[PDB]
């Protein structure tokens, strides 16, 4: 019913996603439902302050879609299960997107702020574990789907924003529904 | 710190005969255990392996039976397959790996380099080419 | 400072009708002018071009006849074609480019976006799609 | 006949070579005898001191070669020319190489010292120039060829080391002789 525009869970090697503060999101291997090794990013600057970390996916082609759907699979670490328990330690992140007809995005061009980047939505975590558990506790990883506007350019980029939480982006999957609702 | 990637391949020459490989990784660093893809040329047939992380016992008896922690399913001749390790004491990820400072960890493959033997559970490569990894954390 | 790359394609849209596009690069800056590979999506075809850096007189008359400094020969649909500009006063590269602060440099392309149009030397997309660049260095 | 293993005057995009101190070598476009656009690297920090900049190539397969040949095309700025005439300007640079059975070269492993990197030779410039003259002064672009001992692993890297100079690597070309003399 739907056609996938980027899956990240097929990589088997670095995704090549851009990380604004290099001291923010960092690419790390993980697993999934079936212990299949996958590419994921994570952030946990819980002990540091004033957090504003950006993860930008590479260029995704629109392949003639009008409404993009973004399915996110992520897990959040309880601030409690962590040795250090400073202030803040959020568990909600922002999903943005930027259009463009050509890649052209550099390490600085698509300004790292909600200015050029149009906000899709703020995602919360309705589940946060305190103990890793490979294979078990599926209901512990989160799954949130959002969709953004009309989109007409050749393609676009997505970007996730962290501001002091301790989470993991297990899987991302852009796509569009090729059949009217 | 990044730590040079461990190219899990028969000609990785760091897998010292009779011993295997030792590392001494510290909390805070990353490590890629990669399986090379066969190049158009230069690469004489891909080498299939199923790399697992096990305990000392299972590692010296070269057996993955009972329990184990999968890491690599090197069965993709056209792609580099890897596993990025993060020696962290606490995973912000459910279904993520955790390492305790001052403990030992052993990665093994009881595969035999062929697709037909990709799922063996007894020796070969581990037993044979001594392809074992011992990580001393802390 | 690495300035946003400038995609040289009919849909770059930063090409305003009238004067084209202006930047104001600063000495020490780096800019890449790129010719897109080929989006297999839509009617999307490769737009052949042959970009040059000419005289203000030339960019106004949208003509590349005589006096030329080639930049891109966009005729390889199978892959990106670029030119990394380094606004520097003194080039260590013999056969290199040197931009002296407070002076204007123009870039045009009299091609029309196709072969049998690729080698045209006047008008073309320069006056058609306003595909021009004016760089006020300082 | 020869067997080229790498060229660079054939990329028309980013070569992707590793520059140790980003302050040194940098990727910049230039031309060739025939005014065709090529990818070149350059260094020219005659103003600062304590220079030791490294440019590292991407993995180069041996493909059965035993004795590798490395052809270099480069130009040197005759310091008297540079507006801020310092006094140093070394008209020499070093060619190094590193063997390996797999890429594995991170941005820190193939140590940036001469020990792990076995030296090929120190290349010197025959001519330097003052006026950048496109298509002209053909005799001002230096071309030097060196070769290094039997290589045995699956591949190798090359590294060009600068230590206070103003040059431009215009072209590099790695190859070997199919059959001995």
Coordinates of C-alpha atoms in Angstrom, one line a residue:
Chain A
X1 CA 0.0 0.0 0.0
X2 CA 3.0 2.3 0.8
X3 CA 6.3 2.9 -0.9
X4 CA 9.4 3.4 1.4
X5 CA 11.8 6.3 0.6
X6 CA 14.5 5.5 3.1
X7 CA 14.8 2.7 5.6
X8 CA 18.1 3.0 7.6
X9 CA 17.5 -0.6 8.7
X10 CA 19.3 -2.1 5.7
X11 CA 22.6 -0.2 6.0
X12 CA 25.1 -2.8 7.4
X13 CA 27.6 0.1 7.4
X14 CA 27.6 3.8 8.5
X15 CA 24.5 5.7 7.4
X16 CA 26.4 8.9 6.8
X17 CA 23.9 11.0 8.6
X18 CA 25.2 14.5 9.7
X19 CA 25.6 15.2 13.4
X20 CA 25.7 18.9 14.3
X21 CA 27.4 19.0 17.7
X22 CA 29.7 16.1 17.1
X23 CA 29.4 15.6 20.9
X24 CA 25.8 14.9 20.3
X25 CA 24.2 12.0 18.3
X26 CA 26.7 9.2 17.7
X27 CA 26.2 6.3 15.3
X28 CA 26.3 2.9 17.1
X29 CA 25.3 -0.7 16.1
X30 CA 22.3 -2.2 17.8
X31 CA 19.7 -4.9 17.2
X32 CA 15.9 -5.1 16.5
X33 CA 13.0 -7.5 16.9
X34 CA 14.9 -10.4 15.4
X35 CA 18.5 -9.8 16.7
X36 CA 19.3 -8.4 13.3
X37 CA 22.3 -6.0 13.5
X38 CA 21.3 -2.5 12.6
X39 CA 22.5 1.1 12.4
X40 CA 21.3 3.5 15.1
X41 CA 22.1 6.9 16.6
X42 CA 22.0 7.9 20.2
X43 CA 22.4 10.8 22.7
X44 CA 22.7 10.9 26.4
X45 CA 24.2 14.2 27.5
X46 CA 22.4 14.0 30.8
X47 CA 25.3 15.3 32.9
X48 CA 26.1 18.2 30.6
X49 CA 23.9 21.4 30.3
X50 CA 22.4 23.5 27.6
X51 CA 21.7 20.7 25.1
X52 CA 20.9 21.2 21.4
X53 CA 21.9 18.2 19.4
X54 CA 21.0 17.7 15.7
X55 CA 21.0 14.6 13.6
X56 CA 20.4 15.2 9.9
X57 CA 19.6 12.3 7.5
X58 CA 21.0 12.4 4.0
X59 CA 19.0 13.6 1.1
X60 CA 15.8 11.7 0.6
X61 CA 14.2 11.8 -2.9
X62 CA 10.5 12.6 -3.1
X63 CA 9.9 10.1 -5.9
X64 CA 6.6 11.9 -6.6
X65 CA 5.1 11.9 -3.2
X66 CA 2.9 14.6 -1.8
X67 CA 2.6 13.5 1.8
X68 CA 5.6 12.0 3.5
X69 CA 5.2 9.6 6.5
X70 CA 8.0 9.2 9.0
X71 CA 8.0 6.1 11.3
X72 CA 10.4 6.3 14.2
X73 CA 11.5 3.5 16.5
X74 CA 13.4 4.6 19.6
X75 CA 14.1 3.8 23.2
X76 CA 14.6 6.1 26.2
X77 CA 16.8 5.6 29.2
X78 CA 15.3 6.4 32.6
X79 CA 17.3 9.2 34.2
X80 CA 17.2 7.1 37.3
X81 CA 19.0 4.0 35.9
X82 CA 21.9 6.2 35.0
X83 CA 24.7 6.6 37.6
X84 CA 24.6 10.4 37.5
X85 CA 21.2 12.1 38.2
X86 CA 21.7 15.8 37.5
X87 CA 18.9 18.2 36.5
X88 CA 16.9 18.2 33.3
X89 CA 17.3 14.9 31.4
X90 CA 14.5 15.2 28.9
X91 CA 12.6 12.5 27.0
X92 CA 11.0 14.2 24.0
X93 CA 12.6 15.2 20.7
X94 CA 11.8 17.3 17.7
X95 CA 11.3 16.0 14.2
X96 CA 12.0 18.6 11.4
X97 CA 12.4 18.5 7.6
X98 CA 14.0 20.7 5.0
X99 CA 13.2 20.7 1.3
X100 CA 15.5 21.2 -1.7
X101 CA 15.9 20.3 -5.4
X102 CA 19.5 19.3 -5.0
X103 CA 21.6 17.8 -2.2
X104 CA 23.6 21.0 -1.6
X105 CA 23.3 20.7 2.2
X106 CA 26.8 21.2 3.7
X107 CA 28.0 21.0 7.3
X108 CA 26.6 24.5 7.8
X109 CA 24.2 25.5 5.2
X110 CA 20.8 24.2 6.3
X111 CA 21.1 26.3 9.4
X112 CA 20.9 24.1 12.5
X113 CA 17.8 25.7 14.0
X114 CA 14.0 25.5 13.6
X115 CA 14.4 28.5 11.4
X116 CA 15.0 27.1 7.9
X117 CA 13.9 23.7 9.3
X118 CA 10.1 23.4 9.4
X119 CA 8.9 21.5 12.5
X120 CA 6.9 18.4 11.9
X121 CA 6.1 17.6 15.5
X122 CA 7.5 17.0 19.0
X123 CA 7.7 13.3 19.9
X124 CA 7.4 12.0 23.5
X125 CA 8.3 8.6 24.9
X126 CA 5.5 6.7 26.5
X127 CA 8.0 4.0 27.5
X128 CA 11.4 4.3 29.1
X129 CA 13.4 1.3 30.3
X130 CA 16.0 1.1 33.0
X131 CA 17.5 -2.2 32.0
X132 CA 18.8 -3.3 28.6
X133 CA 17.2 -6.5 27.4
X134 CA 18.0 -7.8 24.0
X135 CA 15.2 -9.8 22.5
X136 CA 12.7 -9.1 25.3
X137 CA 10.5 -6.2 26.4
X138 CA 9.4 -5.2 22.9
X139 CA 6.7 -3.0 24.4
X140 CA 9.7 -1.0 25.8
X141 CA 10.9 0.4 22.5
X142 CA 8.8 3.3 21.1
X143 CA 7.0 3.6 17.7
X144 CA 5.7 7.0 16.6
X145 CA 4.5 7.9 13.1
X146 CA 4.0 11.5 11.8
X147 CA 3.5 13.0 8.4
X148 CA 4.4 16.4 7.0
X149 CA 2.9 18.8 4.5
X150 CA 2.5 18.8 0.7
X151 CA 6.2 18.7 -0.4
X152 CA 6.9 19.6 -4.0
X153 CA 10.7 19.9 -4.3
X154 CA 12.8 17.1 -5.8
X155 CA 13.5 15.8 -2.3
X156 CA 14.1 16.6 1.3
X157 CA 16.0 16.0 4.6
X158 CA 14.8 15.2 8.0
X159 CA 16.5 16.2 11.2
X160 CA 16.0 15.1 14.8
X161 CA 16.7 17.5 17.7
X162 CA 17.8 16.5 21.2
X163 CA 17.9 18.9 24.1
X164 CA 19.2 17.0 27.0
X165 CA 17.5 13.6 26.9
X166 CA 19.2 10.2 26.9
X167 CA 17.6 8.3 24.0
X168 CA 18.3 6.0 21.0
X169 CA 17.0 6.2 17.4
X170 CA 16.7 2.5 16.6
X171 CA 15.0 2.8 13.2
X172 CA 13.6 5.5 10.9
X173 CA 11.6 4.9 7.8
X174 CA 10.3 7.5 5.5
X175 CA 7.5 6.6 3.1
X176 CA 4.3 7.6 1.3
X177 CA 0.9 6.0 1.0
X178 CA 0.3 5.3 -2.7
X179 CA -3.6 5.1 -2.4
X180 CA -6.1 7.7 -1.2
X181 CA -7.1 7.6 2.4
Chain B
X1 CA 38.4 7.3 21.1
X2 CA 37.6 5.2 18.0
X3 CA 40.0 2.2 18.1
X4 CA 41.1 0.6 14.8
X5 CA 38.4 -1.6 13.2
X6 CA 38.8 -5.3 13.6
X7 CA 38.5 -6.8 10.1
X8 CA 37.1 -10.2 10.9
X9 CA 38.5 -12.1 7.9
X10 CA 40.8 -15.1 7.6
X11 CA 43.8 -13.0 6.5
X12 CA 43.4 -10.5 9.3
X13 CA 46.8 -11.7 10.7
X14 CA 46.1 -10.1 14.1
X15 CA 44.3 -13.4 15.1
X16 CA 47.6 -14.8 16.5
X17 CA 47.7 -18.6 16.1
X18 CA 46.8 -20.3 19.3
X19 CA 45.8 -17.1 21.0
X20 CA 43.4 -15.1 19.0
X21 CA 43.1 -11.3 19.6
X22 CA 43.2 -9.2 22.8
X23 CA 42.2 -5.5 23.1
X24 CA 41.8 -3.9 26.6
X25 CA 39.0 -1.4 25.5
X26 CA 37.9 1.3 27.9
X27 CA 34.5 2.7 28.8
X28 CA 33.8 5.5 26.3
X29 CA 35.3 4.1 23.1
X30 CA 33.8 2.6 20.0
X31 CA 34.8 -0.4 17.9
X32 CA 33.8 -1.7 14.6
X33 CA 34.0 -5.4 13.9
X34 CA 33.7 -5.6 10.1
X35 CA 33.2 -8.4 7.5
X36 CA 34.7 -7.5 4.2
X37 CA 32.6 -7.8 1.0
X38 CA 34.1 -9.6 -2.0
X39 CA 35.4 -7.0 -4.4
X40 CA 34.7 -7.2 -8.2
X41 CA 38.2 -8.7 -8.2
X42 CA 41.2 -9.1 -5.8
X43 CA 38.8 -10.8 -3.3
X44 CA 39.0 -14.6 -3.7
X45 CA 35.5 -15.6 -2.7
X46 CA 33.6 -14.1 0.2
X47 CA 34.0 -15.6 3.7
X48 CA 30.7 -16.4 5.5
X49 CA 30.7 -16.1 9.3
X50 CA 28.3 -15.8 12.1
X51 CA 30.0 -13.9 14.8
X52 CA 28.7 -14.3 18.4
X53 CA 29.6 -12.9 21.8
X54 CA 29.9 -15.6 24.4
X55 CA 31.4 -16.3 27.8
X56 CA 34.9 -17.5 28.6
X57 CA 33.8 -21.1 28.8
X58 CA 32.0 -21.2 25.5
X59 CA 34.9 -19.3 24.0
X60 CA 37.7 -21.8 24.9
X61 CA 35.5 -24.8 24.1
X62 CA 34.7 -23.0 20.8
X63 CA 30.9 -23.6 21.1
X64 CA 28.1 -21.2 20.6
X65 CA 25.4 -23.6 21.8
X66 CA 23.0 -22.9 24.8
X67 CA 23.2 -19.1 24.9
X68 CA 25.0 -16.5 23.0
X69 CA 24.7 -12.9 21.9
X70 CA 24.6 -12.4 18.1
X71 CA 26.7 -9.6 16.5
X72 CA 27.3 -10.4 12.9
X73 CA 25.6 -12.3 10.1
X74 CA 28.3 -12.1 7.5
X75 CA 26.4 -13.6 4.6
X76 CA 26.3 -10.5 2.2
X77 CA 29.0 -10.9 -0.4
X78 CA 28.2 -7.4 -1.8
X79 CA 28.1 -5.5 1.4
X80 CA 30.4 -4.7 4.4
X81 CA 28.6 -6.0 7.4
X82 CA 29.7 -4.7 10.8
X83 CA 28.8 -4.1 14.4
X84 CA 29.6 -0.8 16.2
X85 CA 30.4 -1.6 19.8
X86 CA 30.1 1.1 22.5
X87 CA 31.8 0.1 25.7
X88 CA 29.3 2.0 27.9
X89 CA 28.3 1.0 31.4
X90 CA 24.7 1.8 30.9
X91 CA 22.7 1.5 27.6
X92 CA 20.2 4.3 26.8
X93 CA 18.9 1.6 24.5
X94 CA 16.7 -1.3 25.5
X95 CA 18.1 -4.2 23.4
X96 CA 21.5 -2.6 23.5
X97 CA 24.8 -4.0 24.9
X98 CA 26.3 -3.0 28.3
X99 CA 29.9 -3.5 29.5
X100 CA 31.1 -3.6 33.2
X101 CA 34.4 -2.1 33.9
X102 CA 37.1 -4.7 34.8
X103 CA 35.2 -7.7 33.1
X104 CA 36.3 -9.8 30.2
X105 CA 34.3 -10.4 26.9
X106 CA 34.8 -12.9 24.2
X107 CA 33.6 -12.8 20.6
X108 CA 33.5 -16.0 18.5
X109 CA 32.6 -17.5 15.2
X110 CA 32.2 -21.2 14.8
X111 CA 31.5 -20.7 11.1
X112 CA 33.9 -22.3 8.7
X113 CA 34.2 -19.6 6.0
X114 CA 31.6 -21.3 3.7
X115 CA 27.9 -20.6 3.3
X116 CA 27.2 -24.3 3.9
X117 CA 28.9 -24.1 7.3
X118 CA 27.6 -20.6 8.3
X119 CA 25.5 -22.1 11.1
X120 CA 27.9 -24.6 12.7
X121 CA 28.1 -24.4 16.5
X122 CA 31.3 -26.4 17.0
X123 CA 34.9 -25.2 16.3
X124 CA 36.2 -24.3 12.9
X125 CA 37.9 -20.9 12.4
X126 CA 37.4 -20.4 16.2
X127 CA 39.0 -23.8 16.7
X128 CA 40.8 -23.6 13.4
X129 CA 42.3 -20.2 12.4
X130 CA 42.0 -19.1 16.0
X131 CA 39.6 -16.3 15.4
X132 CA 38.6 -15.2 18.9
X133 CA 38.5 -11.8 20.5
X134 CA 39.2 -11.1 24.2
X135 CA 38.3 -7.6 25.3
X136 CA 39.7 -6.5 28.6
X137 CA 37.4 -3.7 29.8
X138 CA 38.9 -1.3 32.4
Chain C
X1 CA 33.9 29.1 5.6
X2 CA 32.4 26.6 3.3
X3 CA 29.5 28.4 1.4
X4 CA 26.4 26.5 0.5
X5 CA 27.0 24.6 -2.8
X6 CA 25.3 26.1 -5.7
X7 CA 23.5 23.5 -7.8
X8 CA 23.6 24.5 -11.4
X9 CA 20.3 23.1 -12.5
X10 CA 17.1 24.5 -14.0
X11 CA 15.4 24.0 -10.7
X12 CA 18.0 25.8 -8.5
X13 CA 15.4 28.6 -8.1
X14 CA 18.0 30.8 -6.3
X15 CA 18.4 32.1 -9.9
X16 CA 16.3 35.2 -9.7
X17 CA 15.1 36.6 -13.1
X18 CA 17.0 39.8 -13.9
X19 CA 20.4 39.5 -12.3
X20 CA 20.6 35.8 -11.7
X21 CA 22.3 35.2 -8.4
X22 CA 24.8 37.1 -6.1
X23 CA 26.8 35.8 -3.2
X24 CA 29.3 38.1 -1.6
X25 CA 31.9 35.4 -1.0
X26 CA 34.8 36.4 1.4
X27 CA 38.4 35.7 0.9
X28 CA 39.2 32.3 2.4
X29 CA 35.8 31.0 1.4
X30 CA 35.1 27.8 -0.5
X31 CA 32.2 27.2 -2.8
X32 CA 31.1 24.3 -5.0
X33 CA 29.2 24.6 -8.2
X34 CA 27.5 21.3 -8.9
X35 CA 25.9 19.6 -11.8
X36 CA 23.4 17.0 -10.5
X37 CA 23.8 13.4 -11.5
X38 CA 20.3 12.5 -12.7
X39 CA 17.1 11.9 -10.7
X40 CA 15.4 8.8 -12.1
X41 CA 12.3 10.3 -10.7
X42 CA 9.8 12.4 -12.7
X43 CA 10.6 13.3 -16.4
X44 CA 13.9 14.4 -14.8
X45 CA 16.6 14.4 -17.5
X46 CA 20.2 15.4 -17.3
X47 CA 20.7 19.1 -18.2
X48 CA 23.8 19.4 -20.2
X49 CA 25.8 22.6 -19.7
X50 CA 29.2 24.0 -20.1
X51 CA 29.7 26.7 -17.4
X52 CA 32.3 29.5 -17.8
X53 CA 33.7 32.5 -15.8
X54 CA 33.5 35.5 -18.0
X55 CA 33.9 39.4 -18.3
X56 CA 31.1 41.5 -16.8
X57 CA 30.7 42.7 -20.3
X58 CA 30.3 39.1 -21.4
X59 CA 27.9 38.0 -18.6
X60 CA 25.7 41.0 -19.5
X61 CA 25.7 40.2 -23.2
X62 CA 25.3 36.5 -22.2
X63 CA 28.1 35.5 -24.6
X64 CA 31.1 33.3 -24.1
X65 CA 32.8 34.2 -27.4
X66 CA 36.5 34.7 -26.8
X67 CA 38.2 35.2 -23.4
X68 CA 37.3 32.1 -21.3
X69 CA 38.0 30.3 -18.1
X70 CA 36.0 27.0 -18.2
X71 CA 34.5 25.7 -14.9
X72 CA 32.2 22.8 -15.7
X73 CA 31.6 20.5 -18.7
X74 CA 28.4 19.0 -17.5
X75 CA 28.1 16.1 -19.9
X76 CA 28.4 13.1 -17.6
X77 CA 24.8 12.2 -16.7
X78 CA 26.0 9.2 -14.7
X79 CA 27.6 11.4 -12.0
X80 CA 28.0 14.7 -10.2
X81 CA 30.3 17.3 -11.8
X82 CA 31.8 20.1 -9.7
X83 CA 34.3 22.8 -9.2
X84 CA 35.6 23.8 -5.8
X85 CA 36.3 27.5 -5.7
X86 CA 38.8 28.9 -3.3
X87 CA 38.6 32.7 -3.1
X88 CA 42.2 33.3 -2.5
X89 CA 44.5 36.2 -3.5
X90 CA 47.6 34.1 -4.0
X91 CA 47.2 30.6 -5.5
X92 CA 50.0 28.0 -4.9
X93 CA 48.4 26.1 -7.8
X94 CA 50.0 27.3 -11.1
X95 CA 47.1 27.1 -13.5
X96 CA 44.9 28.0 -10.5
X97 CA 42.3 30.7 -9.7
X98 CA 42.9 33.9 -7.8
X99 CA 40.2 36.3 -6.7
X100 CA 41.2 39.8 -5.6
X101 CA 39.0 41.3 -2.9
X102 CA 36.5 44.1 -3.9
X103 CA 36.0 42.9 -7.4
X104 CA 33.2 41.2 -9.3
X105 CA 33.5 37.9 -11.0
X106 CA 30.7 36.5 -13.2
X107 CA 29.8 32.9 -14.1
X108 CA 27.4 32.1 -17.0
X109 CA 26.4 29.3 -19.3
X110 CA 25.1 29.9 -22.8
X111 CA 24.2 26.2 -23.2
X112 CA 20.5 25.6 -23.3
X113 CA 20.4 22.5 -21.1
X114 CA 20.8 19.9 -23.8
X115 CA 23.3 18.5 -26.3
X116 CA 23.2 20.2 -29.7
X117 CA 22.9 23.1 -27.2
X118 CA 25.8 22.1 -25.1
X119 CA 28.3 24.1 -27.2
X120 CA 26.2 27.2 -28.0
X121 CA 28.1 30.4 -27.3
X122 CA 25.4 33.2 -26.8
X123 CA 22.1 33.7 -25.1
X124 CA 21.1 30.2 -23.9
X125 CA 19.9 29.6 -20.4
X126 CA 22.0 32.6 -19.4
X127 CA 19.3 34.9 -20.7
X128 CA 16.7 32.2 -20.8
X129 CA 16.6 31.0 -17.2
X130 CA 18.7 33.8 -15.7
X131 CA 21.3 31.2 -14.8
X132 CA 24.1 33.6 -13.9
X133 CA 26.3 34.2 -10.9
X134 CA 27.8 37.5 -9.7
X135 CA 30.3 37.2 -6.9
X136 CA 31.0 40.4 -5.0
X137 CA 34.2 39.5 -3.2
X138 CA 34.3 41.9 -0.3
Chain D
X1 CA 52.8 -1.4 -20.8
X2 CA 51.8 0.0 -17.4
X3 CA 48.9 -0.8 -15.0
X4 CA 47.5 2.3 -13.3
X5 CA 46.1 1.6 -9.9
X6 CA 44.8 5.1 -9.1
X7 CA 44.6 8.4 -11.0
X8 CA 42.7 11.4 -9.4
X9 CA 42.8 13.4 -12.7
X10 CA 39.5 11.6 -13.0
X11 CA 37.1 12.3 -10.2
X12 CA 35.2 15.5 -11.1
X13 CA 34.0 15.5 -7.5
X14 CA 35.5 15.0 -4.1
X15 CA 38.5 12.8 -4.0
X16 CA 37.9 12.1 -0.3
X17 CA 41.5 12.0 0.8
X18 CA 42.3 12.4 4.5
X19 CA 43.9 15.7 5.5
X20 CA 45.4 15.4 9.0
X21 CA 45.5 19.0 10.2
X22 CA 42.5 20.4 8.4
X23 CA 44.5 23.7 8.6
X24 CA 47.0 22.3 6.1
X25 CA 46.1 20.6 2.9
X26 CA 42.7 21.3 1.3
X27 CA 40.8 20.1 -1.7
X28 CA 40.6 22.7 -4.5
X29 CA 39.8 22.5 -8.2
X30 CA 42.3 23.4 -10.8
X31 CA 43.1 22.6 -14.5
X32 CA 45.4 20.4 -16.5
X33 CA 47.7 21.2 -19.6
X34 CA 44.5 21.0 -21.6
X35 CA 42.3 23.2 -19.4
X36 CA 40.2 20.3 -18.1
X37 CA 38.9 20.7 -14.5
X38 CA 40.7 18.4 -12.0
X39 CA 40.8 17.8 -8.3
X40 CA 44.0 19.0 -6.6
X41 CA 45.3 19.4 -3.1
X42 CA 47.3 22.3 -1.8
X43 CA 49.3 23.6 1.2
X44 CA 50.9 27.0 1.8
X45 CA 51.2 28.0 5.4
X46 CA 54.4 30.1 5.0
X47 CA 53.0 32.4 7.7
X48 CA 52.6 30.1 10.6
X49 CA 55.3 27.9 12.0
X50 CA 55.8 24.3 13.2
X51 CA 54.4 22.8 10.0
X52 CA 53.9 19.1 9.4
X53 CA 50.8 18.6 7.4
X54 CA 49.6 15.2 6.1
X55 CA 47.5 14.2 3.0
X56 CA 46.4 10.6 3.0
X57 CA 45.0 8.7 0.0
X58 CA 42.2 6.3 0.0
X59 CA 43.0 2.5 0.0
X60 CA 44.7 1.4 -3.2
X61 CA 44.5 -2.3 -4.2
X62 CA 47.7 -4.1 -5.2
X63 CA 46.0 -6.1 -7.9
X64 CA 49.1 -8.3 -8.2
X65 CA 51.6 -5.5 -8.4
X66 CA 54.9 -6.0 -6.6
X67 CA 56.7 -2.8 -7.1
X68 CA 54.5 0.3 -7.2
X69 CA 55.2 3.4 -9.1
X70 CA 53.9 6.8 -8.1
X71 CA 53.9 9.7 -10.6
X72 CA 53.4 13.2 -9.2
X73 CA 52.4 16.5 -10.9
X74 CA 52.9 19.6 -8.7
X75 CA 53.6 23.3 -8.7
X76 CA 55.5 25.5 -6.2
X77 CA 54.9 29.1 -5.3
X78 CA 58.1 31.0 -5.5
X79 CA 57.8 32.6 -2.0
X80 CA 59.2 36.0 -3.2
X81 CA 55.8 36.1 -4.9
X82 CA 53.6 35.6 -1.9
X83 CA 52.6 39.1 -0.7
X84 CA 53.5 38.3 2.9
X85 CA 57.0 37.1 2.1
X86 CA 58.1 35.2 5.2
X87 CA 61.5 33.7 4.7
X88 CA 61.1 30.0 4.9
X89 CA 59.2 28.2 2.2
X90 CA 60.6 24.7 1.9
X91 CA 60.5 23.5 -1.7
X92 CA 60.3 19.9 -0.8
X93 CA 57.7 17.4 0.4
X94 CA 57.6 13.7 1.5
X95 CA 56.0 10.7 -0.1
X96 CA 55.1 7.9 2.2
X97 CA 53.1 4.6 2.0
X98 CA 51.3 2.2 4.3
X99 CA 50.3 -1.4 3.6
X100 CA 47.2 -3.2 4.9
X101 CA 45.0 -6.2 4.1
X102 CA 41.9 -4.1 4.5
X103 CA 41.1 -0.4 4.6
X104 CA 40.8 -0.1 8.4
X105 CA 42.5 3.3 8.3
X106 CA 40.6 5.6 10.7
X107 CA 41.4 9.2 11.2
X108 CA 43.9 8.1 13.9
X109 CA 45.2 4.6 13.4
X110 CA 47.6 4.8 10.5
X111 CA 49.7 7.0 12.9
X112 CA 50.8 10.3 11.4
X113 CA 54.5 9.6 11.9
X114 CA 57.3 8.3 9.7
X115 CA 57.8 5.1 11.7
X116 CA 54.5 3.3 10.8
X117 CA 54.7 5.0 7.4
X118 CA 57.7 3.8 5.4
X119 CA 59.2 6.7 3.4
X120 CA 59.5 6.5 -0.4
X121 CA 61.6 9.6 -1.0
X122 CA 61.7 13.3 -0.4
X123 CA 60.5 15.0 -3.6
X124 CA 61.9 18.4 -4.5
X125 CA 60.7 21.0 -7.0
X126 CA 62.7 21.8 -10.1
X127 CA 60.7 25.0 -10.8
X128 CA 58.6 27.5 -8.8
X129 CA 56.4 30.2 -10.3
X130 CA 55.3 33.7 -9.6
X131 CA 52.5 34.4 -12.1
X132 CA 49.6 31.9 -12.3
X133 CA 49.4 31.4 -16.1
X134 CA 46.7 29.0 -17.2
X135 CA 47.6 26.8 -20.2
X136 CA 51.0 28.5 -20.2
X137 CA 54.3 27.9 -18.4
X138 CA 54.0 24.2 -19.1
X139 CA 57.6 23.8 -18.0
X140 CA 56.8 25.2 -14.5
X141 CA 54.7 22.2 -13.4
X142 CA 57.0 19.6 -11.8
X143 CA 56.7 15.9 -12.5
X144 CA 58.6 13.4 -10.5
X145 CA 58.4 9.6 -10.3
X146 CA 59.5 7.3 -7.5
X147 CA 58.8 3.6 -6.7
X148 CA 58.9 1.6 -3.5
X149 CA 60.0 -1.9 -2.5
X150 CA 57.9 -5.1 -3.0
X151 CA 54.4 -4.7 -1.7
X152 CA 52.7 -7.8 -0.4
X153 CA 49.4 -7.1 1.3
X154 CA 46.0 -6.6 -0.4
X155 CA 46.6 -2.8 -0.7
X156 CA 48.3 0.3 0.5
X157 CA 47.9 4.0 1.0
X158 CA 50.1 6.9 0.1
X159 CA 50.6 10.0 2.2
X160 CA 52.2 13.3 1.2
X161 CA 53.8 15.3 4.0
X162 CA 54.4 19.0 4.0
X163 CA 56.5 21.0 6.4
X164 CA 56.3 24.7 5.6
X165 CA 55.8 25.1 1.9
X166 CA 53.6 26.5 -0.8
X167 CA 52.7 23.8 -3.3
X168 CA 49.8 22.2 -5.1
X169 CA 49.5 18.4 -5.8
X170 CA 47.9 18.7 -9.3
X171 CA 48.0 15.1 -10.2
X172 CA 49.0 11.8 -8.6
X173 CA 49.1 8.4 -10.5
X174 CA 49.8 5.0 -9.1
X175 CA 50.7 2.1 -11.4
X176 CA 53.0 -0.8 -12.1
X177 CA 54.7 -2.6 -14.9
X178 CA 52.6 -5.6 -16.0
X179 CA 55.7 -7.7 -16.7
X180 CA 59.4 -7.2 -15.8
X181 CA 62.1 -6.2 -18.3

